[PDB]
């Protein structure tokens, strides 16, 4: 459909069968203004070093695949210059550029709701205990959905399109683009211990085809836009 | 953008709009919500001026309803004589938005919420079942002291932390109008994150979802009057009315029943509706109409 | 219609007058 | 001033009252506003956003299969693909949406309901769907010729792969009640019955059991009055960490 | 007395011994204005097809005849193009033109209060049960009055002239004309399940004469003025 | 402001009080007004409309025969056709009217009472009726020469077939009380006694027992004060579907 | 038309008006009500300036009288111990205009009525006859929650539907002024159809006259305080004052006694007045004067 | 004479000032 | 190819793989002008009640399918508000909006000449007898072509593109649109006994494919544009 | 004025409330201010000192 080019830093993503992007809540990502700032130390602003489209590990799409999610910044907490600035700084303020490539043939049937959840306080099924570090901070590989139908937090996937969302309905869309600004009540927060966003690829229509069932990867490439880093400390 | 609309928008007259090359109802859900309006296609509308209500469904007016947040029925007797864990004529309640599922679900439609909490405390006295005789309802003066989160809370009824030299306390009678106070928007962040995808401390053993910034405080509610020879079940009902609402990043409503105050853990009912595998009560088929007119 | 006699702006009446709304943040978050 | 007589509504605790109450900190300056994205000042901003209808609504459909309807290659024309009851305030496929769950915080609602169906099949899967909202007063149409007399739209999949059937606001009253009865004149809304128009044709190497995701949103003509507690949630018992937020 | 001609559509009624008409509450019938409308779909406005004076079945007038009533639109719910638009539409807004012809000789004594009752919530004598479909929606033939003296609803016939009313006092009036606009709190309502009007022919003075007692028909002809039809569905 | 002392009428619940009370929904916009026909902003709009008097008022007259009076061909002149007591606030032929039932929601009333009699006979039925309202102070006139001294009108049937005897407002006080006694000076109003003037002549093939329907309305000089509960209705026991509107 | 008259209209001086060809008192009832005024014919009137009252008999002032709509006396004890159908310290009342015949007949003079309902709840406590001893009247805080028609109503006193996060509730004491609140004009149509010649649902088995649009809601009234050892008959009297009255299509007043809340079914008294065959108490004859001056 | 301090127009005093009346709707509904 | 939206009344048709429409003989449908009219009674003009796209019964397309035809107004003589106005009026003047949806896969080969024949005086093979009611007025279901190669009237299908015509060549066209105005020598005619138009779906190239042979429906949706109804009588 | 309804927060004793209360001596003039050094009008004056 719409050919889209996203070029930041040394990285560039071209897509030929994408829709219009999902610039979240009508606002571009931006650096912290002076009236908005809290930390009095000067932000790092690495720009092109950390604007790179960090391509994560692609997850395989099958018929029984419930869903996947990568928490931001936890997905990029260890990857590249953004990850190094995450360990080296206690405060950050970065928006994200979500690009999800799901390359499939024209005979492939499937629809991935790519939904960016602000503060996905996830739930745990049949237990009142809060999810631990091993159930929340899965990092670069990213957690699989135990119950994506309820968005794994007691809410509904059926109402998840109020969130910044795209679809990879494989009829006329192979790639999705959601442009998130900074999303927090604080201007800046700890990247190692608070996920301001998460990206959830949920196959609301699973992979169904009657040709040779090939491996369809869901590749997540996140470019941290307008990334700012405050409180230069040691590598946490 | 720049819409300061105060009523529902009126529709214009629509004629036969069979124009080649353009089609409004054909949209892309893979961009967002569709912009195909009523006079554009699929209906030949008439010009009806829409004067319908919008002020009632304002997010302010949606969330400015005083709903219950703390119903605690504590006994009022000689608790110091022989009690172990029960509320010794006083209770410290961690002020959470999550105790009652109605207002919890109402505030959990939004990720971020800047509001001042109009706390109204309606306290009722009943005679406990051990006495089994009325003998009049006493006029009880109660102190509700807002302690900051993590600060020193009282341990007794006369604990000498009830002086309230710096802590803000309200003294109110049961034979009185209910205690109307306004807890400020006191979060260290610019909204209450109703959901928190993170942990409180920098250690890995922290609790998930409990940001102490969005924890409002601790309402320590006590009887200022000393003990009566008759015990009384004092049921104190704190209703919180969220006022000056500024809301951010709207969310799916909570469909499954809530299990815990602390987290968003989920377990649906044993059959639909509001079940884990089926949020909606099931029909017979796709082609079957429930409550069809016959 | 406001009987805000206290010295704090947060203590005022519930301001049910914010009629400005922008649905294009959430309906049409494109281009 | 000095001569003051108490009203009959004095000393009461109204839930929806708006009188200014006392501060607890006498000079508390809150933290200043930052521009958090997506400022929500009215429910209509959330209302007009699409949200998946639970069209399948069947016991064999578990979870993910409920939010889509499996439309298959039919060997014969003029079958009902599906029919959706439009009780946005009563339990149904429109209940688990933004508009349904948020309108169930109200008793009275008004406005047109947009319903966008996205064909989540293959590119080579072709077919025309006819989606007919029928005004209330009669039975749900199980046949297409009884259905196309109402508000019907004919949709070829093509490149756009989604359609919007706008359900218009035809009612005797200005608003529609909840009233807990789906048979009522002021509560029944109509029936969105979707049928095959020219059948769904797929190749042999594409999946025959194609899938469709429907959504309901509204337009800016939507409106809500008489706020009530939503029956979607319910507390029969005090939850976990309650009585541990007190200890 | 007053010669009156009412011409709508293909239908025309001439009367030579009528009074002035009873244009109800001082207002002509009118189509729905744009500021007044609720349904966003375009109304049908059949005009001359449904402005026709639908002549109903005449009821016989005798000495013991208590009274008759036809609920609007229930009397015309199945008759003609208005009836077809009633089954084919869920919403309507039509005023009515009542013309009641009671042709009697100059030696005939009788007075019919033709009274148009808005929302005749009828009663049932000696039972607390609400009247069913067979006691309310009698349709084209129209129900006979069980107790017209109390207007069959607990009210009084004696105060029924506050309603839009005419008389067929057979001294100098043989035909009655009551022009009703749309009468509902809603702008539009379901015609099959709500009677916005009814017309009640009540012989407050019964038929009394000392000539040859001939059959005197009470003929009701209702022309739906400014008829509007919204929500085109199947024939309910 | 701050110094406020409670009045003796503070904290009470007056029925007729007009103080503004609290809303329950803090931002409820009602549905907008449509132009429903016949907007009633005062009771005088209902008061000046005619309404049938129960002139017959006799045990043999059952239902329909009560709202008309059967005037017959009399063989002799100067008989009382009928006499109507004009107690619009007390039980009588004027009670079951718009003016009677609505004025019984008040204790004090004033104004002229129009009383229109429509001759519901044949066209060939001819006769003159003399209708005489007699001011109070004496007995009801059973003879015409004692009746025509009051407010009398002579009415030939003709083509118009109806007359209006306007009962004037002659009273010592500005208003007339209800007071539950029809003999009182401030409660008795007068007597409308209708007589034959030149006898009712009908043909042999027209009905000899002709019928007359009388009505009482008022004019724009009518007025009502001291609102009270009407004794027309009465609850000795809780009706059906009460305690079933609670269950 | 265009009459903004504020008092009763004055009459002008009338002379002998014996004019041939015109006669005012000769009218047509077969058109409507007659226009023959006092100085026109049948009386030689004098010019009296009429300064009489009109504001009291305004339809506003006619219907703005706070009359009783729900007198419910429910017991306040351990209802959970052994009760079956009775009101377990709480009652859900379907807010109808028809429970008490005075205000029912007052609003049933008009077909359509746009008004906001000033609901004033006057609740009285009495000691039940089982206790047979006074022991003081307790100060009871009561919650009246306005639930929309057909929505989820509570089933217990502590039913967890009393949080009132979205539903509007008023908390009020018995040792207080009565609860004054204003239920809005909340009908989905532009007036309350006090009579309904129709059925609620599109099925034929619906109830006649019950339009859910004109059903105001459900006042669920409970004791917020927990149970006392002494039972108390709490008689809650909801008086509804209809305010901002706009009335349409005036009707005959109800003459026969009301039988049912739901419908307008009729059965007069066993003899006149207000009987089915005779609304007025019968005289001896047409020529007989009752209460004639002798 | 109005002490309507609440933010809703429906919460105001009972407006007993609608002195405009048209009896010709119901008295003379002709021509 | 060309995305086309046709919205009339409560009905709307969207197509994504259509061509430009076939507005017949360069003229839009129109109501009867005053200089053009013959009937002196006022036309009904139901507009949005009878502008609805009445979707007919879809016919199955196979390899041996000769062709199908629906006579206008005979196809819509009994369907919906247009059908009710057809029985209730002796005179009508309506143009039509033909939309024929033949949804087929991109691997499906076939070409349907959708040809609108004005006054298809059909023939009968090997008999000189005129076709009766059972051979002409088949109504909503619509007659199948006995010999579509000669257009079933002795003419030629090969010259049928002089008529208002479209093609559903399934390469790059899935839906056809022919916009017919009123087509009669009279301004108005009897709808029950004269077919001013007919629509003929003729598979000049039949359905041929080598994938799984799925049921391909030919769905005919006719929206009567500028429909006018004169001579209000009983339901014929 | 005369029509006054009590708020839910009426009759309560808030600790941080700022409403003006009654004097006990009806004409008490306090001793006038002298310039005592170090007038402290905010806590930040004490806060920024080491």
TrEMBL record, chains A, E, I:
It is found in: Host cytoplasmic vesicle membrane; Host nucleus; Virion. This is Genome polyprotein. Protease 2A: Cysteine protease that cleaves viral polyprotein and specific host proteins. Protein 3CD: Involved in the viral replication complex and viral polypeptide maturation. It exhibits protease activity with a specificity and catalytic efficiency that is different from protease 3C. Protein 3CD lacks polymerase activity. Protein 3CD binds to the 5'UTR of the viral genome. Belongs to the picornaviruses polyprotein family. It comes from Human enterovirus D68 (EV68). The lineage of its organism: Viruses, Riboviria, Orthornavirae, Pisuviricota, Pisoniviricetes. Homodimer. Interacts with host GBF1. Interacts (via GOLD domain) with host ACBD3 (via GOLD domain); this interaction allows the formation of a viral protein 3A/ACBD3 heterotetramer with a 2:2 stoichiometry, which will stimulate the recruitment of host PI4KB in order to synthesize PI4P at the viral RNA replication sites.
Automatic annotation (TrEMBL), chains B, G:
It is found in: Host cytoplasmic vesicle membrane; Host nucleus; Virion. It comes from the Viruses. Protein 2B: Plays an essential role in the virus replication cycle by acting as a viroporin. Creates a pore in the host reticulum endoplasmic and as a consequence releases Ca2+ in the cytoplasm of infected cell. In turn, high levels of cytoplasmic calcium may trigger membrane trafficking and transport of viral ER-associated proteins to viroplasms, sites of viral genome replication. Protease 2A: Cysteine protease that cleaves viral polyprotein and specific host proteins. Belongs to the picornaviruses polyprotein family. Homodimer. Interacts with host GBF1. Interacts (via GOLD domain) with host ACBD3 (via GOLD domain); this interaction allows the formation of a viral protein 3A/ACBD3 heterotetramer with a 2:2 stoichiometry, which will stimulate the recruitment of host PI4KB in order to synthesize PI4P at the viral RNA replication sites. This is Genome polyprotein. It comes from Human enterovirus D68 (EV68). The lineage of its organism: Viruses, Riboviria, Orthornavirae, Pisuviricota, Pisoniviricetes. The chain holds residues 565 to 858 of 2189 of the full protein.
Automatic annotation (TrEMBL), chains D, F:
It comes from the Viruses. It is found in: Host cytoplasmic vesicle membrane; Host nucleus; Virion. Signal peptide: none annotated. Capsid protein VP0: Component of immature procapsids, which is cleaved into capsid proteins VP4 and VP2 after maturation. Allows the capsid to remain inactive before the maturation step. Protein 3AB: Localizes the viral replication complex to the surface of membranous vesicles. Together with protein 3CD binds the Cis-Active RNA Element (CRE) which is involved in RNA synthesis initiation. Acts as a cofactor to stimulate the activity of 3D polymerase, maybe through a nucleid acid chaperone activity. Interacts with RNA-directed RNA polymerase. Belongs to the picornaviruses polyprotein family. This is Genome polyprotein. It comes from Human enterovirus D68 (EV68).
């Amino acid at each position: 459909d719409r050919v889209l080019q996203l070029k930041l830093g040394n990285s560039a993503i071209v897509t030929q069968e994408a829709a219009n992007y999902c610039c979240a809540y009508g606002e571009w990502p931006n650096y912290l203004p002076d009236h908005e700032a809290v930390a009095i130390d000067k932000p790092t602003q690495p720009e092109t070093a950390t604007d790179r489209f960090y391509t994560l590990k692609s997850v395989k799409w099958e018929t029984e695949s419930t869903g996947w999610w990568w928490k931001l910044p936890d997905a990029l907490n260890n990857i590249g210059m953004f990850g190094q600035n995450v360990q080296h700084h206690y405060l950050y303020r970065s928006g994200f550029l979500i690009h999800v490539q799901c390359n499939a043939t024209k005979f492939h049937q499937g629809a991935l709701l790519v939904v960016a959840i602000p503060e996905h306080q996830r739930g745990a099924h049949n237990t009142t205990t809060s999810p631990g570090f091993d159930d929340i901070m899965k990092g670069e590989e990213g957690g699989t959905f135990n119950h994506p139908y309820v968005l794994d937090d007691g809410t509904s996937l059926a109402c998840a399109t109020i969130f910044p969302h795209q679809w990879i309905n494989l009829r006329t869309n192979n790639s999705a683009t959601i442009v998130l600004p900074w999303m927090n009540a604080a201007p800046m927060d700890f990247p190692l211990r608070h996920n301001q966003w998460t990206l959830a690829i949920i196959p609301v229509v699973p992979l169904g085809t009657r040709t040779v069932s090939s491996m369809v990867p869901i590749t997540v490439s996140i470019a941290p836009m307008c990334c700012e880093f405050n409180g230069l400390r040691h590598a946490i | 953008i720049e819409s300061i609309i105060k009523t529902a928008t009126d529709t214009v007259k629509s004629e036969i709009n069979a124009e080649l090359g353009v089609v409004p109802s054909l949209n892309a859900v893979e961009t967002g919500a569709s912009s195909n309006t009523e006079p554009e296609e699929a209906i030949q509308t008439r010009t009806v001026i829409n004067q319908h209500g919008v002020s009632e469904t304002l997010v302010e007016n949606f969330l400015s309803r005083a709903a219950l947040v703390s119903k605690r029925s504590f006994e009022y007797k000689n608790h110091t004589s022989s009690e172990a864990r029960t509320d010794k004529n006083f209770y410290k309640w961690t002020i959470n938005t999550k105790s009652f599922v109605q207002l919890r679900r109402k505030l959990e439609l939004f990720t971020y919420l800047r509001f001042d909490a109009e706390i109204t405390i309606l306290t009722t006295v009943a005679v406990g079942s051990n006495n089994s005789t009325y003998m009049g309802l006493p006029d009880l003066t109660l102190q509700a002291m807002f302690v900051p989160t993590g600060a020193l809370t009282p341990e007794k009824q006369d604990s000498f932390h009830w002086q309230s030299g710096s802590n803000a306390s309200v003294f109110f009678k049961v034979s009185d109008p209910p205690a109307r106070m306004t807890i400020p928007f006191m979060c260290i962040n610019s909204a209450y994150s109703v959901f928190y995808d993170g942990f409180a401390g920098f250690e890995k053993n922290g609790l998930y979802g409990i940001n102490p910034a969005d924890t409002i405080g601790n309402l320590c509610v006590r009887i200022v009057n000393e003990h009566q020879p008759i015990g009384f079940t004092v049921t104190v009902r704190v209703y919180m009315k969220p006022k000056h609402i500024k809301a951010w990043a709207p969310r799916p409503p909570r469909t499954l029943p809530y299990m815990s105050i602390a987290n968003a853990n989920y377990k649906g009912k044993e059959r639909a509706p509001n079940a884990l595998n089926a949020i909606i009560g099931n029909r017979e088929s796709v082609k079957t109409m429930p409550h069809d007119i016959v | 219609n406001q009987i805000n006699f206290y010295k704090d702006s947060y203590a005022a009446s519930a301001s049910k007058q914010d009629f400005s709304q922008d649905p294009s943040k959430f309906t049409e978050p494109v281009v | 001033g000095v001569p003051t007589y108490l009203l009959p509504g004095s000393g009461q605790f109204l839930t929806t009252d708006d009188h200014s109450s006392a501060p607890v900190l006498p000079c508390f300056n809150p933290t200043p506003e930052m521009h958090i994205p997506g400022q929500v000042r009215n429910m209509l901003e959330v209302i007009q956003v699409e949200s998946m209808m639970e069209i399948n609504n069947t016991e064999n459909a578990v979870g993910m299969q409920r939010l889509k309807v499996d439309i298959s290659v039919l060997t014969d024309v003029d079958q009902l693909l599906f029919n959706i009851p439009l009780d946005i305030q009563l339990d149904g496929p429109l209940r688990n949406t933004l508009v349904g769950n948020i309108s169930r915080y109200y008793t009275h609602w008004s406005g047109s309901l947009e319903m966008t169906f996205m064909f989540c099949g293959s590119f080579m899967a072709t077919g025309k769907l006819i989606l007919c909202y029928t005004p209330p007063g009669g039975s749900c149409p199980t046949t297409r010729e009884t259905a196309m007399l109402g508000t019907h739209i004919v949709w070829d999949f093509g490149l756009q792969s989604s359609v919007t059937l706008v359900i218009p606001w035809i009612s005797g009253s200005h608003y529609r009640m909840f009233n807990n009865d789906a048979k009522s004149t002021n509560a029944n809304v109509g029936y969105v019955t979707c049928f095959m128009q020219t059948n769904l044709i797929v190749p042999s190497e594409s999946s025959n059991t194609c899938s469709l995701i429907g959504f309901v949103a509204a337009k800016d003509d939507f409106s809500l009055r008489l706020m009530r507690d939503s029956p979607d949630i319910g507390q029969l018992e005090h939850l976990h960490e309650a009585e541990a937020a007190y200890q």
